[PDB]
């Protein structure tokens, strides 16, 4: 038995910033999820958190394909008899662009106790300005 | 068994209607104090074998005893009155082991009365020899008349 296991005594985390201008919604969300989990490190351990923090700016001008602007619909239920709501993806972009990105990425992470903690390291902002200057975020290009 | 245990003639309760297991008597095998099933019963354990094999077994015992130098041919036992100490000294003179079987031809009263309170000694005649007496005994002491009777009777 020779296998190395990472633990909280030696985990290192850093910050990244990614531009969401001119990218497809799903092609960007799949790449961000591989970073929050820590799939890009050589010390990946399944039962401990290893991934890094991600900042997403310019959450507007996120681009769809086809007729998704009007056809793609999001449903929710309030658990009351007869109450089901609905909203169009082209309507959520102009009124809550942060939730559009945030929910898409959170749908690509496991729903365990560790999955919720790993999803709390994503910050999404609709403009080009973010307030996390105390850290030293680095620019990241998408594969 | 069920029939021999005292009581238990009537049914304890009705067959159905109440929520309980159905029972017929209070002396069933599964009741406390009820009858026993498939238990001991008086019988005999004895059996028999061909006459020719009852004699082949006795000669085998005598031959095995002779093989290990456990045979002692002596003269007549000359006792006039029962006395345990004289026979104890006689046994110790001839260098005999703890368990000895002594064999004669007829019933010797003065030999059997003594030598019988000594733990480990039994007296027998020529027509009273056993497979168990010979095998249990450690050495055999016989008289010439008894030896001749044993040789002539057996074969």
């Amino acid at each position: 038995r020779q296998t190395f296991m990472a633990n909280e005594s030696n985990i290192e985390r850093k910050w990244y910033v990614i531009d969401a201008e001119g990218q497809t919604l799903g092609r960007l969300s799949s790449e961000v999820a591989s970073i929050l989990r820590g799939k890009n490190k050589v010390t990946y351990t399944p039962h401990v958190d290893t991934g890094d923090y991600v900042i997403v700016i310019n959450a507007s001008k996120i681009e769809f394909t086809g007729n998704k602007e009007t056809d793609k619909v999001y449903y929710r239920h309030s658990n009351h008899p007869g109450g089901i709501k609905s909203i169009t993806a082209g309507e959520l972009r102009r009124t809550n662009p942060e939730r559009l990105i945030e929910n898409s990425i959170k749908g690509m992470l496991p729903s365990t106790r560790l999955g919720e903690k790993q999803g709390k390291k994503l910050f999404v902002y609709g403009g080009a300005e973010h307030p996390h200057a105390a850290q030293q975020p680095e620019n990241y290009e998408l594969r | 068994n069920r029939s021999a245990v005292s009581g238990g003639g009537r049914k304890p309760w009705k067959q159905k209607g109440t929520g309980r297991a159905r029972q017929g008597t209070i002396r069933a095998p599964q009741w406390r104090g009820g009858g026993i099933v498939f238990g001991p019963t008086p019988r005999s354990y004895a059996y028999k074998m061909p006459k020719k094999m009852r004699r082949l077994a006795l000669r085998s015992a005598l031959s095995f005893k002779v093989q290990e130098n456990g045979l002692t041919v002596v003269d007549a036992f000359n006792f006039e009155a029962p006395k345990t100490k004289e026979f104890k000294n006689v046994l110790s003179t001839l260098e005999q082991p703890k368990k000895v079987l002594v064999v004669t031809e007829n019933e010797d009263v003065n030999v059997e009365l003594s030598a019988r309170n000594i733990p480990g000694v039994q007296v027998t005649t020529a027509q009273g020899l056993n497979v168990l007496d010979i095998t249990n005994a450690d050495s055999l002491v016989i008289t010439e008349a008894a030896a001749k009777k044993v040789e002539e009777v057996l074969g």
Binding site: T3, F4, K39, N40, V42, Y44, P46 | -
Partner: protein
């Protein structure tokens, strides 16, 4: 002769209750419930001894993939390149080298690229 019980039924029932320590509630106290869980534990452990080998091979391959991507190539082309050269080092040793010796791994990625 009559043969009764005692000192035989109690002895074997205590052995079962003693293998269930740490179990929740009545599953470490009562013999009948504990007996069932001890049988399920043996069935689980037989299955899990053979799933433990599939779980660790996956972990090594995930780490080899991450290290190789840092050298502008994927896992699938790395194992083909090593096979065409004859390295014969298994996934357990390649993972232990990438974590510890950073520039020894680069000595193996080159030969995997030399043979294409």
């Amino acid at each position: 002769p009559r043969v009764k019980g005692g000192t035989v039924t109690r002895a074997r029932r205590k052995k079962t209750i003693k293998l269930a320590k740490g179990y929740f509630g009545s599953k470490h106290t009562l013999y009948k419930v504990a007996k069932q869980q001890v049988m399920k534990s043996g069935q689980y452990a037989f299955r899990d001894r053979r799933q433990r080998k599939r779980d660790f091979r996956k972990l090594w391959i995930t780490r080899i993939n991450a290290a190789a991507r840092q050298h502008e190539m994927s896992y699938s082309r790395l194992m083909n390149g090593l096979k065409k050269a004859g390295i014969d080092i298994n996934r357990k040793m390649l993972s232990e080298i990438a974590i510890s010796d950073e520039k020894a791994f680069a000595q193996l990625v080159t030969k995997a690229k030399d043979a294409l």
